[PDB]
Structures are given as structure tokens and as C-alpha cells.
Design a protein around this ligand. Structure first.
Ligand SMILES: [Zn+2]
Length: 418
């Protein structure tokens, strides 16, 4: 029997996940059409752009790219996910301490890390871990904790598969399919709360996120985010399509050369919350999200970005960022971003003239080298004993995304003769 690859399980999962989300949240279906139209147009209106992209095998991924957002309340639950995603070629990258912003959670991003896997299908799932010690009311922290430790979000057949996988160190086609369906069940949405209304209202009142994580079955999808080449255009076309976006657009301001990523949200639906044993229920909001991703920033550039932010309303932002160079040449010159250097047909011809240590600038102007920008695969930084704690819960340290991009850039320099 053939041993199915990770890229194969990941892309099938992503898609299954997407279809389920679509049947759950229709507005998401509409959203996809709108993004497709906008991406097509942007390509139509910019042939060179379309040329650049085709030359860098980055146009295909644009049609399947999405990221998921999920929340869990226990280190245990977080370790199983670490196992489940490993079987799909996704590894925990970086650390985000959303507590630094009031949200009682902290997190990481499970995603592929090799160039080909990213290019083939870059599925990502922002995974957040609840931090009960950040729950004021101790009575509630107590109840939350109780519910969380006595519950189980994975299907038995799903835990069985993680075990079989460990034994064989691989899955077969029939198990790969089954794994995809059983895992999909952990993220499905259910209306039935797993608590009484009184408990729900009390936890919700303490903090919406808390009730979201403790009062519902598995860990339903918070949001599924498709990717676009122009966030502003999408934001403008949404109302025409029945979607009321929200003025705010996080990330840097519109730029010739995008950096990191820009994103915005919107209410995709208000769901009904039910309670076993009674007619009266309540409701909760499922928010949709959209993003546009630019070049990955260097430690020096991420620092510039953070400082500039720490200095600033969208007009004031744009004003502030005039400081951040807005041309690949300038950004490359000051070591602000990550580029993938590739030889040009002309360049490979003269390959024997390119030597290690050489300055790429001359070779680029000569037409021999091209600096492709490396896409940002991670998330926006949120404006210690927490990281290590989180790493303890996870079961391993989180990868340093800067080290990832650097290696990728270095890898390409070798491939070129540097
Ligand atoms: Zn997100």
C-alpha cells in the first residue's frame, strides 16, 4: 500500500475543512467568489505582476490558501493537536502572547516549513491556549477548569489513528481518508452548549472568549481566512455583496511593496446557542476574516515596524510609515526583508562568473539575478515564563520564524553561487 504524504493529507483536510465551514457559514461561500473576482482582476490589470508570480510558482497556492483559528483550554488538548498537525506536515511556529492585549490566551501557528510544501498548499491554523490564571473571578476559574479537565474533544477513532500512526510511522490511503474525517469532527460546529444557561451566562459575562472555549463541544472553527491580492478592493466590494466589513485594517498601511500582512474582519453570522432540557437559548457571533500577505520581514525590519507602530487614524499610520522604505531595492539594501535570489537564464549562462560573497545589486542590474520576495507565512505581532509555560504545554519549543526565512534566503544564495 502506498504511504500517503503529509502534503496530501494537509490539502485534503484544508479543503474538507473549507467545505464544512461553507455549509456552516454561507457568507463564507460568497466571500470566496468575491476574493476570486478581485484576485483575477488584479492579475488582469497587472500583467507584469502576473508574470513575476508565475515565474515564482506562487500563483497556484493563491487559489487554495487559508488559515484556521482554533482555541483550546488544556495543555493536553494542545499536545494532541501538535501530534495531529505533524501528521499533516505542519509545525508550531513562533509564539504570540495575546494576554499583552487583554485576551486570556497565548498561542502559536502550526504551518509547513519547507519551501515546496508552502508552495503546494500553505494551510495554517492559529492555535490559542486558554490561560485560566488570567480569569479574575476565582469561582469561575474553578468551574472553567473543572469542565475542561472532565471533557474530551477528540473522537476515540481519532486517538486510535494517532497511535497507529506512531507505530507504522505512516498511514495508508484508507487510514488517511478516515483520519481526515475523524479529525474534521473535532472542529465541527454544534449549537448545543455543554452547560446549563446559568453557567453560560456567568462565564460569558466574565469574558466571551471563556464561554466560547468551555461551553461548546470540540473546538469549533473561530474563522477560516482565504487570501487576497488587494484587501482594500475586497473591503469596498463587500457591501455590494451583503457583507458589512469594518473600517479597521490591521497591519501596516497600503504600500507599493506590502510587508507582513493586512487583515480585516466582519460578522459572518449570528448563531443560535441551545441548552439541553429547555426551549430558551441565546446566541453568539461567528466572525469572518480576510487577509493580504506581503514580504517576510527581517529582525531589523520587524523591529522598525514595531517601533513605527509604537509611535502612532489610517491617515496618521500611513504618515508614520513613510519612514519604512517602500521599494524592494531599498528594503533589500538595508537588510529589512527576506528575498529569494534566483539566477536568470542569462544568469545561469554566466553562472561561472558569480562567486560566493558577491554583491547581488550589480548582478541584478546586469540582468543575471532576480530578488524574489519571500512571502510572510506567519502573523502580526501583538501590540518569558509564558513562552516556556506554553512550550511546556505544547510538548516542544516553538520554531523561530526568523531562522526559517533566513535559512530559506541563505538556501537560495547557495543555489545562485553565494
Ligand atoms: Zn486569523
Amino acid at each position: 500500500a502506498n504511504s500517503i504524504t503529509a502534503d496530501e493529507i494537509r490539502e485534503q483536510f484544508s479543503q474538507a475543512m473549507s467545505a464544512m465551514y461553507q455549509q456552516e457559514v454561507p457568507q463564507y461561500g460568497t466571500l470566496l467568489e468575491l476574493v476570486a473576482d478581485v484576485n483575477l482582476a488584479v492579475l488582469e490589470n497587472n500583467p507584469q505582476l502576473h508574470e513575476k508570480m508565475v515565474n515564482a510558482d506562487e500563483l497556484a497556492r493563491l487559489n487554495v490558501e487559508r488559515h484556521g483559528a482554533i482555541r483550546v483550554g488544556t495543555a493536553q488538548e494542545l499536545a494532541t493537536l501538535r501530534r495531529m498537525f505533524a501528521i499533516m506536515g505542519m509545525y508550531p511556529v513562533s509564539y504570540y502572547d495575546l494576554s499583552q492585549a487583554g485576551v486570556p490566551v497565548h498561542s502559536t501557528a502550526f504551518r509547513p516549513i519547507d519551501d515546496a510544501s508552502l508552495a503546494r498548499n500553505p494551510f495554517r491554523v492559529f492555535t490559542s491556549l486558554l490561560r485560566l490564571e488570567l480569569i479574575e473571578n476565582e469561582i469561575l476559574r474553578q468551574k472553567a477548569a473543572e469542565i475542561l479537565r472532565q471533557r474530551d474533544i477528540f473522537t476515540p477513532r481519532c486517538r486510535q489513528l494517532l497511535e497507529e500512526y506512531e507505530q507504522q510511522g505512516g498511514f495508508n490511503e484508507t487510514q488517511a481518508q478516515e483520519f481526515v474525517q475523524e479529525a474534521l469532527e473535532t472542529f465541527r460546529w454544534h449549537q448545543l452548549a455543554t452547560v446549563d444557561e446559568e453557567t453560560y451566562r456567568a462565564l460569558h459575562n466574565e469574558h466571551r472568549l471563556i464561554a466560547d472555549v468551555v461551553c461548546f463541544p470540540g473546538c469549533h472553527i473561530n474563522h477560516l481566512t482565504p487570501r487576497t491580492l488587494d484587501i482594500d478592493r475586497v473591503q469596498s466590494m463587500m457591501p455590494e455583496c451583503g457583507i458589512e466589513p469594518k473600517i479597521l485594517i490591521e497591519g501596516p498601511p497600503r504600500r507599493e511593496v506590502p510587508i507582513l500582512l493586512r487583515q480585516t474582519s466582519f460578522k459572518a453570522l449570528e448563531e443560535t446557542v441551545l441548552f439541553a432540557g429547555q426551549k430558551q437559548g441565546t446566541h453568539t457571533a461567528r466572525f469572518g476574516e480576510i487577509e493580504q500577505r506581503g514580504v517576510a520581514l527581517t529582525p531589523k525590519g520587524r523591529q522598525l515596524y514595531d517601533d513605527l507602530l509604537r509611535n502612532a487614524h489610517q491617515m496618521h499610520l500611513q504618515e508614520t510609515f513613510r519612514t519604512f522604505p517602500d521599494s524592494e531595492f531599498l528594503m533589500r539594501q538595508q537588510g529589512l526583508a527576506w528575498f529569494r535570489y534566483r539566477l536568470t537564464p542569462s544568469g545561469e549562462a554566466h553562472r561561472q562568473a558569480i562567486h560566493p560573497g558577491d554583491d547581488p545589486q550589480p548582478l541584478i542590474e546586469r540582468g543575471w539575478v532576480v530578488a524574489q520576495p519571500i512571502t510572510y507565512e506567519d502573523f502580526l505581532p501583538v501590540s518569558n515564563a509564558s513562552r516556556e509555560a506554553f512550550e511546556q504545554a505544547l510538548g516542544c519549543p516553538v520554531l523561530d520564524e526568523f531562522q526559517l526565512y533566513q535559512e530559506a534566503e541563505e538556501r537560495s544564495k547557495r543555489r545562485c553561487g553565494l
